[PDB]
Amino acid sequence: ERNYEESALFEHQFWLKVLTDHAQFLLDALAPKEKEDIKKATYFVETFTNLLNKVRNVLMAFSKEAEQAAKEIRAFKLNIIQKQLEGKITIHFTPTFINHMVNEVEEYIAVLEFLKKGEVPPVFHELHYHLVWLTDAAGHAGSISGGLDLVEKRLKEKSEEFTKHFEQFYLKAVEMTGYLRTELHHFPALKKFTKDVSLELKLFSHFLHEVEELELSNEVLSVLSARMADHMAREECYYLLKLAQSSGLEMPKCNPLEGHHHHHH
Amino acid sequence: ERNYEESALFEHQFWLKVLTDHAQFLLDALAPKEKEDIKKATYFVETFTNLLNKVRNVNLMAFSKEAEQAAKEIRAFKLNIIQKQLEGKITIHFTPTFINHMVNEVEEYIAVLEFLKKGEVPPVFHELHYHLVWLTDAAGHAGSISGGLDLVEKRLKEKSEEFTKHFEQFYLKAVEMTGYLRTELHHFPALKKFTKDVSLELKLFSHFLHEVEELELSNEVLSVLSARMADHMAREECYYLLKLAQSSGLEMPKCNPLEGHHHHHH
Amino acid sequence: ERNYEESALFEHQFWLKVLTDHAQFLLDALAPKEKEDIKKATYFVETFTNLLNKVRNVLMAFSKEAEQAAKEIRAFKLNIIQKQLEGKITIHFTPTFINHMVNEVEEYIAVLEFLKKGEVPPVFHELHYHLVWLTDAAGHAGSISGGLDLVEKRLKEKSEEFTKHFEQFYLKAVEMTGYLRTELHHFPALKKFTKDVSLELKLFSHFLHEVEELELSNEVLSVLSARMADHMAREECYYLLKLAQSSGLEMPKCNPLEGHHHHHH
Amino acid sequence: ERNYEESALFEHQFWLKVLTDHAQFLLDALAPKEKEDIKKATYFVETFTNLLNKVRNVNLMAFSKEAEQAAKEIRAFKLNIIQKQLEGKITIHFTPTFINHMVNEVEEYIAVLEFLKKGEVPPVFHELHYHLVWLTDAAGHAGSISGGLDLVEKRLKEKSEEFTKHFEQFYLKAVEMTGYLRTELHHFPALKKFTKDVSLELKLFSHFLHEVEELELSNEVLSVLSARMADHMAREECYYLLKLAQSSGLEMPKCNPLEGHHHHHH
Amino acid sequence: ERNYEESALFEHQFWLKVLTDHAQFLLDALAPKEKEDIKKATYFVETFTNLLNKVRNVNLMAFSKEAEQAAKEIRAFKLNIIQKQLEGKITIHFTPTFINHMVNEVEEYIAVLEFLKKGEVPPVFHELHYHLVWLTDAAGHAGSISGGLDLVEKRLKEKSEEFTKHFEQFYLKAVEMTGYLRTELHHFPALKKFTKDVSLELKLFSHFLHEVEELELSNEVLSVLSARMADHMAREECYYLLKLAQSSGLEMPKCNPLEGHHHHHH
Amino acid sequence: ERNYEESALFEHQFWLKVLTDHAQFLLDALAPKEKEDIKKATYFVETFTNLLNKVRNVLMAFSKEAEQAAKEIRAFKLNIIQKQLEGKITIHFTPTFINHMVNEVEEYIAVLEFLKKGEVPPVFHELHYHLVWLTDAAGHAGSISGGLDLVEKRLKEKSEEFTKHFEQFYLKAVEMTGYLRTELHHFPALKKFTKDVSLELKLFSHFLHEVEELELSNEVLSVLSARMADHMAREECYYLLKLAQSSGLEMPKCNPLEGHHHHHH
Numbered sequence A, C, F: 001e002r003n004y005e006e007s008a009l010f011e012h013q014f015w016l017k018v019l020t021d022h023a024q025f026l027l028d029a030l031a032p033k034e035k036e037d038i039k040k041a042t043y044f045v046e047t048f049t050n051l052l053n054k055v056r057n058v059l060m061a062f063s064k065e066a067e068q069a070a071k072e073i074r075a076f077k078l079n080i081i082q083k084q085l086e087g088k089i090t091i092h093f094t095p096t097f098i099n100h101m102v103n104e105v106e107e108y109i110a111v112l113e114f115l116k117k118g119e120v121p122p123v124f125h126e127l128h129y130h131l132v133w134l135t136d137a138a139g140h141a142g143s144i145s146g147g148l149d150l151v152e153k154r155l156k157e158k159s160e161e162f163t164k165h166f167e168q169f170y171l172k173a174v175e176m177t178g179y180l181r182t183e184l185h186h187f188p189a190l191k192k193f194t195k196d197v198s199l200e201l202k203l204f205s206h207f208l209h210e211v212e213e214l215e216l217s218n219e220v221l222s223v224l225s226a227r228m229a230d231h232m233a234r235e236e237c238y239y240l241l242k243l244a245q246s247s248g249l250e251m252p253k254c255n256p257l258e259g260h261h262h263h264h265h
Numbered sequence B, D, E: 001e002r003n004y005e006e007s008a009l010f011e012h013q014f015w016l017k018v019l020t021d022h023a024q025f026l027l028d029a030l031a032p033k034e035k036e037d038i039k040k041a042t043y044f045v046e047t048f049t050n051l052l053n054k055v056r057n058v059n060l061m062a063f064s065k066e067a068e069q070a071a072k073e074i075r076a077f078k079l080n081i082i083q084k085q086l087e088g089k090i091t092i093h094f095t096p097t098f099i100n101h102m103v104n105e106v107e108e109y110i111a112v113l114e115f116l117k118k119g120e121v122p123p124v125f126h127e128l129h130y131h132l133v134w135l136t137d138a139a140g141h142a143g144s145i146s147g148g149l150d151l152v153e154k155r156l157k158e159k160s161e162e163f164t165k166h167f168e169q170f171y172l173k174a175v176e177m178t179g180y181l182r183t184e185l186h187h188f189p190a191l192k193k194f195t196k197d198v199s200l201e202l203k204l205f206s207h208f209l210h211e212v213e214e215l216e217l218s219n220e221v222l223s224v225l226s227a228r229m230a231d232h233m234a235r236e237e238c239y240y241l242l243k244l245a246q247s248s249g250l251e252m253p254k255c256n257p258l259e260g261h262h263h264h265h266h
Ligand SMILES: [Fe+3]
Pocket: A018, A022, A101, A104, A231, A235
């Protein structure tokens, strides 16, 4: 039984860390010459770090401040995409990956709509999560693939296989969303789908933790980072959690808030 | 410039022939035991065949309302069939996704009909609107050929599986670019480039559908498909090609969305 | 040690159920407009159902009546193929799948040659079974593949992999049949072959039972049916049984007569 | 129309050159320790080389009986080799399937010889007869090139693996259509279409074998194959192409089943 | 015949433009926090841009020594970056292998410089020397495009993955033939054939790089690549093509290793 | 702690058996008409068999005699390659496979440089072993693939997969050798590489033993031999051993000197 206080702390912690990550990633991905956007990214790193440090159980007002910041970084991201599409920026992220960051900040914002009214955010239909997080997981596996050294063939084959699986799941979710026009909103093919997707997310989380350990030990050749692998696995964990709650499955044993290495306790 | 009389006639004739086909395909795909649904699909074959041949430049707005009623009814029939498939309550030889694509289509007619009933020329939508509609549709066309071919038609199956893949991949790209629109830039070179690449593929796919229709007409291919299905799929790709040429600013296609080159009596 | 009574009851039950299945499948696969062939299929459903209900241990005469019916449905099937090849029928089965039904009725008929004389049908050379049932298994996996929704990619990949395996085994059986002109009729590469094929049939039976459970629960999107999956698994079971007996292998634990769901006891 | 003198000479010269080649290939593929079998293969090289050059329009029926004796003997030698392979009793660098294909071939000569000994023109068989014989043969040709190429000849290997696949797939289709013949319809459009598709592929494969023979002659390819093997494989595909053109009613091929363009002294 | 003035100018201008590019690429690929290395890469951009534009037919031997000093320094900078990557001590958006290829390249300039400082025309090396250098380089070019393309650029990615594969396969073949040289036969038909096949592929790859550069210039491709990277990769393939034509005895390429067709101001 | 006596006996036994194998393989692979090279191969079979029978712990002088023979068979092999490249010999081995035999005799010779001075041969950098033995393993898997009957599809797919893995590892070793110009000679990506390669060699050894058992029982259709499979597995074992010692890994449980079947005790 979900309540305002715990739900709000959880969401704020989950999302404000993700956005702090985004800001850091963007920052390190900008070419040195991009002074103006580097100043913007640095501002976002400071802003989300401060907000995360401030989160506490006394919250409706905090959520309005969180929202305003979220809308701001959303605009920064879309501004970057806009310049990518016009050949006006050098940044080492592709437009789609930044497009996925935008999908993500918009999920926070949707949650903030409830939180700043003092309402518990509902658990949406399980297809809402699939339509958001499946392209996100595919992009995740895809960045891994693109980020590995030419010589990391086995690791690339593996992440290409995940990319393909998540893309195929996405197409299935698109069609199943169409089936909802029948006004039958839960039916056995949909419940089996969510279950098949959760198993794949379980396998992918395992792969992300391996990649994280490989990055931490410098045993993999790549332009990825342990922090990116940790970030991806926290997001897959949130997605699993929302699936388990929306669909009536076993809860996952993972923490969307914090990974097993990336902390100072 | 597009005018009411010509736009309305063209849209009616395209969509009412398409909906006649759906009804005919559904009718043929039901197991003989499905008496109730067979009654309904036959009523649908008769209804759209009639409306197809009734449409003319006499009382077109009024005609639009009659078309609209019939389109909502076949929509509800399709959705009822899908409901029963998801509950294991009907035997029909189409998979739920194919019939889901038929729903996507009738809903497109219904959107066009909103303007036609008001005596307005429907607009040409942003090219990404058409992509997000017709790319899954084309992938389903290619996948349905692939699943309809005999076990031993391996070279033909390889070829339609490759079309299915390209169209699904084009779809994933359309989905992402649609999100790029959040920048408030609604036209940009990668989008125009995309719509050209898609147009090329549709032209390649139309040649292939034409080949498949001719193999069907000569009994040279082993399958459960039919020449009329291939003709139908080719007319829809033409319509998609046409809307992309108009919305994106490309050369008009040389193909007729209304009538294939074999399925006519003149 | 095989005897007439048990062998005859087993074969009649196995085959008369398969033919009842065929007749039902054909019936539901004909377009409503195919009145004449629907009346024929319905006649075959009634005829094989009655014969199966009648089977009893008092048999030579029964086998002649079974034969006449088998020859009749054989002619109906070939008539359908003939019209497929001439564009004269709408039916939702491809010519090859019906071609395989014909291969199958002809195996019954071969068995009936013995049974109506009161002889125990022999166990044929193991290659006779491979030459019949390997294209049959490939067609089985192939129908599954063709019968799944566009969005069932993982299930399609799996059944495509089985199709390919059975086709490859078929080509091997063709060549090994050529080796028999040496007059060496059993040799170690042939025994290993039959063993490798039995393991693949064991894996495929598992896949067919999963698909059956997915159909029964409506968890898969397809135009297949639980009854078709049950039918396919009973045939693979018969094939395994004939392989074990012809080649000297462990007997399979499966029932060619009746599946775990499709019954009323 | 086909007459005795020309049919007989053509068939003898084709098959006796083919059987000379087999014997030569077997001789070269035996490990030096296999003295007994090397004696036999040498006797076979000498025997078919002689008969190849002996055949002429003088006492052809009588000649047919001498050919036949020698063909049964090399058949039994091939089958003995396969027997020993299956029992691990011989070292020879051909796999059992390749030698099994040589048996399929000598058996084809032997069937033709039944008519030639009686002074009759062998008939042209149903096109499916030729398919069921030569399609596995072609797949084995392509697979033998593929297995004969150096580790590093990856592009050439990809290309022969793709031919192997197509020919195996054509074979699966021939097998099914042969069963369609149970309808008592022995000619139908899908069959005629099949034989045309197969003919195209054989023409593509013959160009490839020609390329491989020229790479062998110039030492430009790393392999254990030989230009004479490629020439041999091309002459057999020509014979198959020829019989399909005659049996199915297609344009005659432009290739010579009797003599390649490099392996002659004139 | 090759003379000092022209060989020296050509080599300087090629390699100093290549090294200018590397420095520029490294500079852009460093995370803003990497102040020390950004200072160094900027010094490198300025240094090779200067030397590029300084080289002329006045005091060329002396100039060679200044080039050489700067080439050793950027070499040591590249190797230091790779060292830090292997120890997890730098954030830079190139993988260690790509920067390893930059080292292979500067080492090639440095070998040429040994002759240029002595006032000698560098020789044209055995064709296998160039293969063993540029084939991994080309595979890395194709793989870097492949990894630089957006998730949704699936058709472009398929195409560069296929180039990557062919170049890696050509490399495995170069490695083996290099061992064949132990026979003391340094030229043989399979080698000449190889170098022709490789030359064809490089021409196919150059067309593709040209396509990619034009997609970059028009913003029609989604990627983190740049038109200047594609231009750079095309100029290097040209240089490789040129050295193969000279070393192996093939027709000279029609492409300019010094300047692309878009990246100039005249 | 490695000493002269044990190291010298081990190396001599390992290598003189490999060379005896090479000579036998070459001998059986020559077309009967190649009289001169058959006499040469037979001479090499006798010469390495005698040397292997003679090996004993009383060694520096023996090593000079071993060397001279090794240089001779090296010249015979290169002479064969030379004739392959000029179309002057019929032999059923491709130039590369013989090229790999040359790589191998040259490793013996490198070891003999030390042994004939009475020095313990060092364990080289682990990359030296990768650069030699990875193309060798790929060629091994490749010969298996090329040596199987057309109908052995599953076995071919498997050995093609190993070929590809070893080739990919080779490309990785090439680049990592380039990284050594940093003067950092051991780093975590290299240690993980050697470990990943050892696992693949463990899987491949298992595959080679299966193929050996299939050859011994005549259950596989091929032109390979049990002795070739044994030979390949002894070489993979030596490579594993050198990797474990050069890189600091667990020692393999396999014998580079002698396989589980091919012996007379
Ligand atoms: Fe994120």
